[PDB]
Coordinates of N, CA and C and ligand atoms in Angstrom, one line a residue:
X6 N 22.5 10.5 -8.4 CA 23.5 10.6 -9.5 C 24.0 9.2 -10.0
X7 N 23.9 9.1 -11.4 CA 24.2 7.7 -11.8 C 26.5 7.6 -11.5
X8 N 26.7 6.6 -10.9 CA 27.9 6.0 -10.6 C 28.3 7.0 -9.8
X9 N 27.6 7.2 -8.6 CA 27.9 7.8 -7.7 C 28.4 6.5 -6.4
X10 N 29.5 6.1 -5.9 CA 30.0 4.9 -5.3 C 29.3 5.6 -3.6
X11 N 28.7 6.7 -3.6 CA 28.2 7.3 -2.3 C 27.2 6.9 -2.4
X12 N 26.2 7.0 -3.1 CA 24.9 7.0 -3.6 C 24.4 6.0 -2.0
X13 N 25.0 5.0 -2.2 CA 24.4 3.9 -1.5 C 24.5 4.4 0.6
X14 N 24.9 5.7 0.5 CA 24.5 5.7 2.0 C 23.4 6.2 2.3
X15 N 23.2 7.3 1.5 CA 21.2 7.7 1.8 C 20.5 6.7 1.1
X16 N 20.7 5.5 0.1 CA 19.9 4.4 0.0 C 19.7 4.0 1.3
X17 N 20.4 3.2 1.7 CA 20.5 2.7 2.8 C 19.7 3.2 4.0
X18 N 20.2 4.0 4.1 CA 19.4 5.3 4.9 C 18.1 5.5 5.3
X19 N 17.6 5.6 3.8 CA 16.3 5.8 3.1 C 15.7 4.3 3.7
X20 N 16.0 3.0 3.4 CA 15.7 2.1 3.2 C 16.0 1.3 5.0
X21 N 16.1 1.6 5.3 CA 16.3 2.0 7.3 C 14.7 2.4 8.0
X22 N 15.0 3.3 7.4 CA 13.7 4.7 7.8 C 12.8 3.9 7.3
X23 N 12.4 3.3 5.9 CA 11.3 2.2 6.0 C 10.9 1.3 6.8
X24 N 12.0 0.4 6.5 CA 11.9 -0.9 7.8 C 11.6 -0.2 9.2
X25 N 12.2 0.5 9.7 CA 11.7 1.1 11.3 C 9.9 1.2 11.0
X26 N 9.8 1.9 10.3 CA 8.2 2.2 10.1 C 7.0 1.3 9.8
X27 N 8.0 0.1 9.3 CA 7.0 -0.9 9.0 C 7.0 -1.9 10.5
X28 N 5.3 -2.4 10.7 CA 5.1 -2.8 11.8 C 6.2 -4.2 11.9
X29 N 6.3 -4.8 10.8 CA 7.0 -6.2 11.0 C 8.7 -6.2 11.0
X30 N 9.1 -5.0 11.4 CA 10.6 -4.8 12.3 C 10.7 -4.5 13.5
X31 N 9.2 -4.6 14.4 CA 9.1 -4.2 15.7 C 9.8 -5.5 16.6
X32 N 10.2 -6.7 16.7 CA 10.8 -7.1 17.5 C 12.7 -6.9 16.9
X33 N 12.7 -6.4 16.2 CA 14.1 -6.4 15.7 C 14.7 -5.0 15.8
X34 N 14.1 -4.2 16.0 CA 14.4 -2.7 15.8 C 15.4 -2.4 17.0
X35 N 15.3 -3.0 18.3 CA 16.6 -2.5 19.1 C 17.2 -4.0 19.8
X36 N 18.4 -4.1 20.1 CA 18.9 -5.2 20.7 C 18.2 -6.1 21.4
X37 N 17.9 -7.4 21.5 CA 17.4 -8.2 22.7 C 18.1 -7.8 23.6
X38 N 17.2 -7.8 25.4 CA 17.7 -7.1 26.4 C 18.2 -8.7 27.0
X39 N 19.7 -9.2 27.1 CA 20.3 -10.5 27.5 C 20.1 -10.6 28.6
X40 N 19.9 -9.3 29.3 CA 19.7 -9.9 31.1 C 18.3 -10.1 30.9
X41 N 17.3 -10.1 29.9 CA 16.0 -10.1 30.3 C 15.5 -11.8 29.6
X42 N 16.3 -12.1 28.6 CA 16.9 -13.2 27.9 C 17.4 -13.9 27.7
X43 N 17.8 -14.7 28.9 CA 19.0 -15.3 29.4 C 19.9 -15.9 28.5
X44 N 18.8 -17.0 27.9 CA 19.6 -18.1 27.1 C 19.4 -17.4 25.6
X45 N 19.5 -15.7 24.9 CA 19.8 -15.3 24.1 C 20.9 -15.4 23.6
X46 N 22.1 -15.4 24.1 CA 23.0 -15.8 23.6 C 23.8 -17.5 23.6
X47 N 23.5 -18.2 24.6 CA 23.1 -19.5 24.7 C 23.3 -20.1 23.0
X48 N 22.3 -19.2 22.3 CA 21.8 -19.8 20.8 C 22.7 -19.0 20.1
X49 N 22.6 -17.7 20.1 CA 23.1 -16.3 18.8 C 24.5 -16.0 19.2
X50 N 25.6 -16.2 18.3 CA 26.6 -15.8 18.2 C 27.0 -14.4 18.9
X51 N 26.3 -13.6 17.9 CA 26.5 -12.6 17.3 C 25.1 -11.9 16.9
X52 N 24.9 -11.1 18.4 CA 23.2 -10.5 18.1 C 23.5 -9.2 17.2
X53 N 22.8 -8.7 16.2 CA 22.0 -7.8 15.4 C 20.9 -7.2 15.7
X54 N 20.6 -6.0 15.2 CA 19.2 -5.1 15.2 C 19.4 -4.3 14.5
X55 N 18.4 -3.4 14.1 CA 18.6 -2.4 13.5 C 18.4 -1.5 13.9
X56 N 18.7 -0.6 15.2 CA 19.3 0.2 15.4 C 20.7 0.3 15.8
X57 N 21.2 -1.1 15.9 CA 23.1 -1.2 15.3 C 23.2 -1.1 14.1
X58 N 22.6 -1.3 13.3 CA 22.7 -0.8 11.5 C 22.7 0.5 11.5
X59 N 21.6 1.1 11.9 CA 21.5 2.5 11.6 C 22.5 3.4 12.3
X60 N 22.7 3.2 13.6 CA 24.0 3.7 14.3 C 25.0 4.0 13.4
X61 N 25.6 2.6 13.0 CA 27.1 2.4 12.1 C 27.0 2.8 10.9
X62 N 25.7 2.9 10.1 CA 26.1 3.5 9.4 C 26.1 5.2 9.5
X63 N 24.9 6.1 10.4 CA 25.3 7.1 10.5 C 26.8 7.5 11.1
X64 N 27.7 6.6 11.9 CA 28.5 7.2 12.5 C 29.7 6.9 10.9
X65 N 29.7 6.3 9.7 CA 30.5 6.0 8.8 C 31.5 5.0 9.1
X66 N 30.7 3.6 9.9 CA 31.7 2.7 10.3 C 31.3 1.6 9.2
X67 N 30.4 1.4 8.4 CA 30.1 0.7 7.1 C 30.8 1.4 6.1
X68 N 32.0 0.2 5.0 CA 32.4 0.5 4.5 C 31.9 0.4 3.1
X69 N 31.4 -0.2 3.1 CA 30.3 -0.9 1.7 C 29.4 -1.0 2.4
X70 N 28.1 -1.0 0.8 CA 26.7 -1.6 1.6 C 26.5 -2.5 2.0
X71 N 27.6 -3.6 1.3 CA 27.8 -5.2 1.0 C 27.9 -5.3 2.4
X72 N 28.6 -5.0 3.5 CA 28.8 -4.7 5.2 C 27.2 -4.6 5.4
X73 N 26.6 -3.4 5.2 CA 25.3 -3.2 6.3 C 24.6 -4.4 5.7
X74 N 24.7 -5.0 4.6 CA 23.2 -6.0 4.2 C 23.8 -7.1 5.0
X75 N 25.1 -7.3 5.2 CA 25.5 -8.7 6.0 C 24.9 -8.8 7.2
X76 N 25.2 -7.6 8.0 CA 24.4 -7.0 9.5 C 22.9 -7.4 9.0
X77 N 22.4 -7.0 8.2 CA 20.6 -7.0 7.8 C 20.9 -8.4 7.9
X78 N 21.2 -8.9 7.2 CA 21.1 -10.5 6.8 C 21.1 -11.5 8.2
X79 N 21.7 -11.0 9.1 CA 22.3 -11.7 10.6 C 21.2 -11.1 11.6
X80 N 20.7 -10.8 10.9 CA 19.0 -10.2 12.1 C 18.3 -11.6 11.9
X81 N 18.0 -11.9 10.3 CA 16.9 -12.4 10.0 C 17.6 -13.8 10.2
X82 N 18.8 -14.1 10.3 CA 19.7 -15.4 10.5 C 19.4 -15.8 12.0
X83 N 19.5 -14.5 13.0 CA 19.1 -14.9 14.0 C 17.8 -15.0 14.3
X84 N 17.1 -14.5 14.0 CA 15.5 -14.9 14.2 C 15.5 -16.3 13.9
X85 N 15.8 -16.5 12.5 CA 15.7 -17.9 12.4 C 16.0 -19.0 13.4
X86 N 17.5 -18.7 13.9 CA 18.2 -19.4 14.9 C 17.3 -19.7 16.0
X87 N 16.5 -18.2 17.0 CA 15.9 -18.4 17.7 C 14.8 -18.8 18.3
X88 N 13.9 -18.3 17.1 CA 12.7 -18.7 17.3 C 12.3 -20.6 17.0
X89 N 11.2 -21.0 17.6 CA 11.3 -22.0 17.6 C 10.5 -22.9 16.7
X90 N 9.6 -22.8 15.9 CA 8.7 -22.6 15.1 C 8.6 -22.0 13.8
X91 N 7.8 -22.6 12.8 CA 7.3 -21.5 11.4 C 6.1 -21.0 11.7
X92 N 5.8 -21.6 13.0 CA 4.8 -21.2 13.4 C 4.6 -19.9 14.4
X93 N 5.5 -19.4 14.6 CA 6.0 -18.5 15.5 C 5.9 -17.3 14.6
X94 N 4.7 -16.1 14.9 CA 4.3 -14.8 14.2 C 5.9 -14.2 14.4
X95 N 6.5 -14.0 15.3 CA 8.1 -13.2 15.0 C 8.7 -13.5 14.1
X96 N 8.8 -15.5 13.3 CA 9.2 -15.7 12.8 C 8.9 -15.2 11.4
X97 N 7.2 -15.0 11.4 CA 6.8 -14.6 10.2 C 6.5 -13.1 9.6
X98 N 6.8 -13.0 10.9 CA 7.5 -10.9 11.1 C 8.4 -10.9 9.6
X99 N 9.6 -12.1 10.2 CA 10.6 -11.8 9.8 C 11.4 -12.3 8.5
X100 N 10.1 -13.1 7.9 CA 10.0 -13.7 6.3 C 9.6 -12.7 5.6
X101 N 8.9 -11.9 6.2 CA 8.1 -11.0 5.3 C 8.9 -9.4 5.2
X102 N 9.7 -9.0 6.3 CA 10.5 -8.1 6.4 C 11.9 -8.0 5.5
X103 N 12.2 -9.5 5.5 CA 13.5 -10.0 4.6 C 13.6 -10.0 3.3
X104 N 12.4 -10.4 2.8 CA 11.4 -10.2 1.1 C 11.9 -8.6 1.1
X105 N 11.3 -8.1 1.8 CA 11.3 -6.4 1.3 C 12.3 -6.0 1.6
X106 N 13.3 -6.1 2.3 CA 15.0 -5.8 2.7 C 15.4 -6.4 0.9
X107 N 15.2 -7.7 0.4 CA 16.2 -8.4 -0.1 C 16.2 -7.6 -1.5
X108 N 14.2 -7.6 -1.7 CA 13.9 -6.4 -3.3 C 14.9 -5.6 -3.2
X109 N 14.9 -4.5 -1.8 CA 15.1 -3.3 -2.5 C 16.7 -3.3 -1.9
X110 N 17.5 -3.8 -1.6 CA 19.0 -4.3 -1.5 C 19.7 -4.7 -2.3
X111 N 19.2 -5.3 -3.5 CA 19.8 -5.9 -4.8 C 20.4 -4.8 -5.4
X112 N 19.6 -3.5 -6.2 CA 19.9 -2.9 -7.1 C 20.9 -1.1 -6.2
X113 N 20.7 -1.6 -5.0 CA 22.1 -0.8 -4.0 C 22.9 -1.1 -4.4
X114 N 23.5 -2.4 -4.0 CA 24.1 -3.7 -4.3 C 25.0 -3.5 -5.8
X115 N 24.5 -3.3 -7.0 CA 24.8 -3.6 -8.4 C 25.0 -2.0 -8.2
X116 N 24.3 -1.0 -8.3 CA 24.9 0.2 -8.6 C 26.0 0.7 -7.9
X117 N 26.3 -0.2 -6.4 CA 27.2 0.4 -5.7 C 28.2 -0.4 -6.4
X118 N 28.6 -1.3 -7.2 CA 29.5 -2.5 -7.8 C 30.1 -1.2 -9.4
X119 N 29.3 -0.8 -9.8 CA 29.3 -0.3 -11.0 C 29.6 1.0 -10.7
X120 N 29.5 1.7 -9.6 CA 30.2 3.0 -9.5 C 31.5 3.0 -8.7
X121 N 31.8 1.5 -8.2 CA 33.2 1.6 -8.4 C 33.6 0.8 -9.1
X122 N 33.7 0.7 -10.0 CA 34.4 0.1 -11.6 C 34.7 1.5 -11.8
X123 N 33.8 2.3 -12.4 CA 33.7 3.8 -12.6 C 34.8 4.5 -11.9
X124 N 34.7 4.4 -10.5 CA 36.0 4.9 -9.8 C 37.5 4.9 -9.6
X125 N 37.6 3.7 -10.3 CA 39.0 2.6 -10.3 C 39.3 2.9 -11.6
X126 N 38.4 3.1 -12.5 CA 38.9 2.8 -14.2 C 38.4 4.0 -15.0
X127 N 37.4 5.1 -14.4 CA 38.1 6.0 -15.3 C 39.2 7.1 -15.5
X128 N 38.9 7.9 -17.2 CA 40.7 8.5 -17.0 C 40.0 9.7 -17.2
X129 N 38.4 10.1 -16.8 CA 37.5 11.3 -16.7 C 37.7 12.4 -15.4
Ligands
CA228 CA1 14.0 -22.0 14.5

């Protein structure tokens, strides 16, 4: 539905259920295991994955989508951070998974912006 300010949680959703399925979210799809990891945190603030994305947002702890893409964004931030290399296939997992996150994230992004203007301002 056009200016629907909901719209963006089955995007989201929807756009979850991809990335899981596509082979180059396989090292990102569930938390690094830290006791298996030592110096994982050593480097990463603040670990990500996307099955903490998908959790929070099924449980309705994302309040915007502008929230879950930050979480998206802090996967591929840490990848960066950790891996050591461009030369590193995880690394290039996660160039190419980011591309396809970033496409189809934009126009969530702008319709979720415009259905609340819609929300706030009209007298319909
Ligand atoms: Ca690096």
């Amino acid at each position: 539905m056009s200016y629907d300010i909901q719209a963006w949680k089955k995007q989201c959703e929807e756009l979850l259920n991809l990335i899981f399925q596509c082979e180059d979210s396989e090292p990102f799809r569930q938390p690094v295991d830290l006791l298996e990891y030592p110096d994982y945190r050593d480097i990463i603030d603040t670990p990500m994955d996307f099955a903490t994305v998908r959790e929070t947002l099924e449980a309705g702890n994302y309040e915007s989508p502008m929230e879950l893409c930050k979480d998206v964004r802090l996967i591929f931030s840490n990848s960066k951070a950790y891996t050591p290399s461009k030369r590193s296939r995880i690394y290039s997992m996660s160039l190419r998974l980011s591309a396809f996150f970033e496409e189809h994230i934009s126009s969530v992004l702008s319709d979720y912006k415009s259905a609340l203007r819609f929300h706030k301002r009209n007298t319909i």
